[PDB]
Write a protein that holds these residues in place. Structure first.
Motif, PDB file in Angstrom:
ATOM      1  N   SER A 184      13.488 -21.573  40.269  1.00 43.03           N
ATOM      2  CA  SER A 184      12.530 -22.469  41.070  1.00 43.03           C
ATOM      3  C   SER A 184      13.220 -23.880  41.477  1.00 43.03           C
ATOM      4  O   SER A 184      12.998 -24.346  42.305  1.00 43.03           O
ATOM      5  CB  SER A 184      11.365 -22.498  40.639  1.00 43.03           C
ATOM      6  N   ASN A 185      14.148 -24.284  40.454  1.00 46.79           N
ATOM      7  CA  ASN A 185      14.888 -25.710  40.522  1.00 46.79           C
ATOM      8  C   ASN A 185      16.045 -25.615  41.398  1.00 46.79           C
ATOM      9  O   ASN A 185      16.757 -26.647  41.659  1.00 46.79           O
ATOM     10  CB  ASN A 185      14.845 -26.461  39.256  1.00 46.79           C
ATOM     11  N   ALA A 186      16.435 -24.459  41.780  1.00 48.55           N
ATOM     12  CA  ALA A 186      17.675 -24.441  43.018  1.00 48.55           C
ATOM     13  C   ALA A 186      17.354 -23.984  44.380  1.00 48.55           C
ATOM     14  O   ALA A 186      17.653 -22.791  44.699  1.00 48.55           O
ATOM     15  CB  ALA A 186      18.587 -23.624  42.387  1.00 48.55           C
ATOM     16  N   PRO A 187      16.532 -24.745  44.912  1.00 46.16           N
ATOM     17  CA  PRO A 187      15.804 -24.016  46.127  1.00 46.16           C
ATOM     18  C   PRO A 187      16.850 -23.810  47.287  1.00 46.16           C
ATOM     19  O   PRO A 187      16.338 -23.039  48.139  1.00 46.16           O
ATOM     20  CB  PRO A 187      14.974 -25.537  46.569  1.00 46.16           C
TER      21      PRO A 187
ATOM     22  N   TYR B 166      18.151 -22.295  36.690  1.00 47.67           N
ATOM     23  CA  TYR B 166      19.191 -22.901  37.969  1.00 47.67           C
ATOM     24  C   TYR B 166      18.864 -23.924  38.199  1.00 47.67           C
ATOM     25  O   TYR B 166      17.623 -24.252  38.629  1.00 47.67           O
ATOM     26  CB  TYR B 166      19.509 -21.711  38.976  1.00 47.67           C
ATOM     27  N   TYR B 167      19.817 -24.816  38.786  1.00 47.85           N
ATOM     28  CA  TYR B 167      19.755 -26.416  39.200  1.00 47.85           C
ATOM     29  C   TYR B 167      20.686 -26.375  40.250  1.00 47.85           C
ATOM     30  O   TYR B 167      21.614 -25.699  40.072  1.00 47.85           O
ATOM     31  CB  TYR B 167      19.765 -27.442  38.092  1.00 47.85           C
ATOM     32  N   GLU B 168      20.581 -27.410  41.048  1.00 46.63           N
ATOM     33  CA  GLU B 168      21.713 -27.732  42.049  1.00 46.63           C
ATOM     34  C   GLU B 168      21.732 -29.312  42.390  1.00 46.63           C
ATOM     35  O   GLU B 168      21.138 -29.988  41.865  1.00 46.63           O
ATOM     36  CB  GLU B 168      21.165 -26.762  43.594  1.00 46.63           C
ATOM     37  N   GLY B 169      22.935 -29.447  42.755  1.00 47.39           N
ATOM     38  CA  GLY B 169      23.426 -30.876  43.070  1.00 47.39           C
ATOM     39  C   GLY B 169      24.827 -30.861  43.513  1.00 47.39           C
ATOM     40  O   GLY B 169      25.496 -30.058  43.869  1.00 47.39           O
ATOM     41  N   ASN B 170      25.144 -32.185  43.239  1.00 46.71           N
ATOM     42  CA  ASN B 170      26.665 -32.652  43.381  1.00 46.71           C
ATOM     43  C   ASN B 170      27.539 -32.710  42.222  1.00 46.71           C
ATOM     44  O   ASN B 170      27.031 -33.877  41.289  1.00 46.71           O
ATOM     45  CB  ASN B 170      26.834 -33.927  44.398  1.00 46.71           C
TER      46      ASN B 170
END
Ligand SMILES: [Ca+2]
Ligand SMILES: [Zn+2]
Length: 132
Positions: free
Chosen positions: A9-12, A44-48
């Motif tokens: 859910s934290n990697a939309p 899972y997470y996302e970003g730069n």
């Protein structure tokens, strides 16, 4: 067969590619299966991050995966996501390997789009999860 639970859910931005990567692993191995749900083992997470995507994991089901925006645009995102999930399942980086190895990651370059583990990678995950 053991079930390892993940939280996407934290990697939309990556929902489809996480589903794809989970289905690829589930279709490939016998002794562990991945399922989305609560009280998850890994997330899972996302970003730069200019280093690319990475996994913070004990290598046996727990921890988290960071999906970097640039890497997932320049390389096939299913291969990247399935690759990092391979670390949570216990497989190491092998950057000198060919495209037919999922665990060579970005070594073969952005023309390599294969997201499937090979026979040896499948066998090793089955053995690592044979006893839970
Ligand atoms: Ca793909
Ligand atoms: Zn890796």
């Amino acid at each position: 067969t053991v079930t390892v639970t993940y939280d996407p859910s934290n990697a939309p931005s990556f929902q489809q590619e996480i589903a794809n990567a989970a289905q690829i692993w589930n279709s490939s191995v016998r002794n562990v299966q991945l399922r989305a749900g609560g009280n998850a083992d890994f997330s899972y997470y996302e970003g730069n991050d200019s280093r690319g995507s990475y996994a913070q994991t004990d290598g046996h089901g727990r921890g988290y995966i960071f999906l970097d925006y640039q890497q997932n645009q320049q390389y096939d995102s299913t291969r990247v996501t399935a690759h990092e999930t391979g670390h949570v399942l216990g497989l190491p980086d092998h950057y000198q390997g060919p495209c037919s190895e999922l665990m060579s990651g970005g070594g073969p370059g952005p023309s390599c789009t294969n997201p499937y583990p090979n026979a040896q990678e499948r066998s090793r995950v089955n053995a690592l999860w044979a006893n839970g």
